[PDB]
Each structure stands twice: as C-alpha cells, then as structure tokens.
Amino acid sequence: ADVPAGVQLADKQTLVRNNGSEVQSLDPHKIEGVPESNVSRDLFEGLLISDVEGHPSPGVAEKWENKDFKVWTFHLRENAKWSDGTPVTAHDFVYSWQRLADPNTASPYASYLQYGHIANIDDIIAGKKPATDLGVKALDDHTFEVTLSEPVPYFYKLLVHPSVSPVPKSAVEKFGDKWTQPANIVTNGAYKLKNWVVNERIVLERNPQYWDNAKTVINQVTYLPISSEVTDVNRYRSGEIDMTYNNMPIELFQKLKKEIPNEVRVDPYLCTYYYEINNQKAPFNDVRVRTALKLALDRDIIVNKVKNQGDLPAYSYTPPYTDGAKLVEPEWFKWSQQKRNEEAKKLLAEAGFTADKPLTFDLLYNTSDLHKKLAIAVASIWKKNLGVNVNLENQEWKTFLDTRHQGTFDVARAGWCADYNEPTSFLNTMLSDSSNNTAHYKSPAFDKLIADTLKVADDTQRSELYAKAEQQLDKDSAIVPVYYYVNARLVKPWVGGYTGKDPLDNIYVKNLYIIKH
C-alpha cells in the first residue's frame, strides 16, 4: 500500500469484505470465478500482478524480456519466498504450469495455456504428450523461460491470473486435496490463510515472508460468503462489513445512492451479463430457438426499468470498451422491441412451437437477490413477448458452475469478466475445445477466425477478426447478451487505496489501508 503523506492510519488495520459466495476452492488450479480470484490474489502471487490501477506490473518476476513475442524470459526476484520461509523459484512455476496443463488436474482453466499458446499445450490437454513436455523451463532458480508456438504480443497481460500462480509442490503432494487447509497450506502472496469455515468466513493474516511485506498495511482481512446482496448491504450499514461484494440489490440501490452517495462506487467493468444457452441440448441446438430467446428479451426493460444501476444494454459477448474491441452493432439491436418480438415469434412458430405445445425450459441461476429478480423479470418478459414458459432454479455458486460445465442444463444466468484486457480473454472461451466453454458452443468458423488473429501481425486486422468472430457468435445466437456490467459496490470512507480505475477489478488487500475514523 502507498499511504499518502498526512493520512492518519487507524490503530487497528483490519478489513472485512463480502465475497459473494463460498469459494469453489483455494487451489489456484481448481478455480474459475471472481470470489475465488478475490481470495487467490491475496494468497498466491504469479509472475506479474496488477498495480492499484490495474496495469500489469512486477510480481515474483522483477523484470522480463521477450524474443519475437515467442520466447519470454522472466527474472524472478531473489527474495521471493513462500510463507514457510522457503524461496519461490522458477522450478515452482515449472511444476505449477505443468500441473495446470495436466488433464488429471481437470482445471477449468487448463485452456489458459492454449490462450497464451505455450508450446505443446494442445497435445498435453489431449493426453498425446505428457505435461512435462510443456514449453516452460527453469534456466536457473531465478529464471523462468516460456516458449510459445506463435507470437503473442499481449502474452504478459495474461500472467496476473490465478491459474498461472505458483502452487507449493510439497504440500500438494503430501496432502492431496487437503493441501489448502490452514494447517497444511503454504502461500506466497501478501497474506496467509488463518481460518476457513465453510459458509461462514475466510480469514487471512499478513504473511511476513512476503517479499514486499514492509509495504503491507492491513494485518487481517476476512472474506464473507454472503450471496444475498440485501444482507451484504445490511451488514455493511451495521458496521460489520467494510467493502460489499460488487453485486447490488434491486430493493435498496436507488435508496443507497441518495443516502450515502460518496460510498457508492460505480466504475467501468469489463464483464458481460448474459443468459448462457446450452447449445448442445435440444431444442437449444436449433438457431431459431436461440435467436428467438435473444431477440424477445427486452434489454431496455431489464437494464433501465428493472435493474437501473448504470449497466449498458448488450449486443455482444466481448464488452465494446475492451482494449482492442471495435465491434459492429448488429441491426437487430437498433430495431424496436416490437419488431424483435414479431421476428422471435416467427422463428419459434417456424421451429414447431405453438400454444398447444409451447416452449418450456429451465432457467438456472446462482442464489442471489439480484439474479433471482432479474430471472423473474426475464421469465415474465419471455412469457409476454414470446409465449415461452420458464422454470426458475437456484443453485449455490460452486454447484451452479459444476452444472454448467456438466451440460446438465437448458439456459443459465451467466457473467464473464475479462482476465486480461484484450478481446481474446472473452473470445477464447467460445472456442470448441475451451475448458471455459460452458455454452458448449462448437463452431469451426468461429474457431478459424480466432486462430487467424495471431497469424497476422497487425492490430487492425486482429480487431476486424475479433469483430467478425463476434458477428459469427451473434449469427449463431450462441448466447443471449443482456448488459455490460458496471462495477458498483459500497466502500466505507475509511477504506483507502481502492481507486476503481482497474476495469478488471483485480484488488489486492496489500494495497489498501484503514484511515483513522
């Protein structure tokens, strides 16, 4: 943390943050969501980290070079250590990225190594080559060298993500799935795990071995698992919570902006809220059905009437303000909702559905005030505009993600937030073989457009290809875009160091501080 000259620090430097749900895991190779990543950034530190404004910056690597954007050499600081005092070395990175690539680990982020095009990853994922063939090596204890199969000018931007953080081989090996328990875990971020009580709290304490420990200010941070946005706001206003999760309740938000304007933080956020259709399951394998659902949803009602928190109606997957996005707004987005409804009814009438045999399906969402209220509204809109019937089902976060990976669903509420600010952070998740493809969408045409982006060495050609890839997704109605999120949350006046400038919202508690109050 960089405390401004003249700010008076509180005697007690403790923080309580709501984290939206119980995490999937604390193992960097078994996680894929925002709540998980929030805790992961405090515990595990990779090659680079984001600074307080989100810029990729030195993490365990103090400096790095690239040869033709294909060979990346990371010089690791000599004093990087784990919480047990042992050094973090390039060998830790070699073992960790191999473990991520290994199919036996079954990471939801195995494909992150395909996104960076680390040599031999496709064969490793397919079981054709062992994980030790991965294009990574330790040239010495403090030098990690990464070899890609094609030039990737933005490669270093990927390296702030939890999937590429190091994990301690000796703890993993000795304790298996219990390596993350407080008595067994070993960490290299600013914090260490003190307590983990499922569905109650996660408490982290300062890690004195952290290389940058002298600049850490907060001594203890607690992460809560509260999925009710209403309850989160209530416990923030009672004094318990210092920073809510960034999902805001429809019941209270309008009141909140009028009651505590200065605590309501609203900033840009590279995330898209959408309804994920399971493209492999009939009748959702029919584009007419998917297009009807996409067109009949009334974004103006959802975004400005039912939610009204500053979100922008969406017509694509990749947010248009992603660095490198130059998207073409489709003609259906400019039409009237009436015109979109007739088209939708027409397509559904064409797909075999009638009043006697209507379209009825499930709408899965993770337990939340916000998502339930949006799903109820979407169900009403779809019923009125298209005559379809939907059965709402809530599931807790960890189970909800598993269900979508399992492809035991019809339509699911969904949200993707960028992992690095470049359109492929979104677009690579729709590749046929991506480990993050929960839409279960497989288009050889889409795959080809993305494959072509690194075969050109021109930003303009790349952007035009990303635009076309979005048009292909849209043409196939792989998803139902709803809105581009804003990052809205409450932060107490005494919480310093949170700028809101990072559109990825990669917060590190080591950067915050409590002002005397």
UniProtKB/Swiss-Prot annotation:
Nucleus among keywords: no
A family per Pfam: SBP_bac_5
Predominant location category: periplasm
GO CC aspect terms: ATP-binding cassette (ABC) transporter complex; outer membrane-bounded periplasmic space
Cysteine pairings via disulfide bonds: 271-417
Gene inactivation effect: Mutant cannot take up cell wall peptides.
Keywords: Disulfide bond, Peptide transport, Periplasm, Protein transport, Signal, Transport
Regulation: induction: Part of the opp operon, which is constitutively expressed.
Subcellular localization, as worded in the UniProt entry: Periplasm
UniProt miscellaneous comment: Isothermal titration calorimetric measurements of the binding of lysine-containing peptides of different lengths to OppA show that the dipeptide Lys-Lys is bound with 60-fold lower affinity than related tri- and tetrapeptides (Lys-Lys-Lys and Lys-Lys-Lys-Ala, respectively).
Domain-level remarks: Accommodates the ligand side chains in large hydrated pockets which impose little specificity on binding. Tight binding is achieved by utilising the hydrogen-bonding potential of the main chain of the ligand.
Homology family: Belongs to the bacterial solute-binding protein 5 family.
Role noted for this protein: Part of the ABC transporter complex OppABCDF involved in the uptake of oligopeptides, including the cell wall murein tripeptide L-alanyl-gamma-D-glutamyl-meso-diaminopimelate. Plays an important nutritional role and is involved in the recycling of cell wall peptides. Binds peptides containing from two to five amino acid residues regardless of their sequence. Also binds cell wall peptides, such as L-alanyl-gamma-D-glutamyl-meso-diaminopimelate.
Record note on quaternary structure: The complex is composed of two ATP-binding proteins (OppD and OppF), two transmembrane proteins (OppB and OppC) and a solute-binding protein (OppA).
Record-given protein name: Periplasmic oligopeptide-binding protein OppA
Organism: Salmonella typhimurium (strain LT2 / SGSC1412 / ATCC 700720)
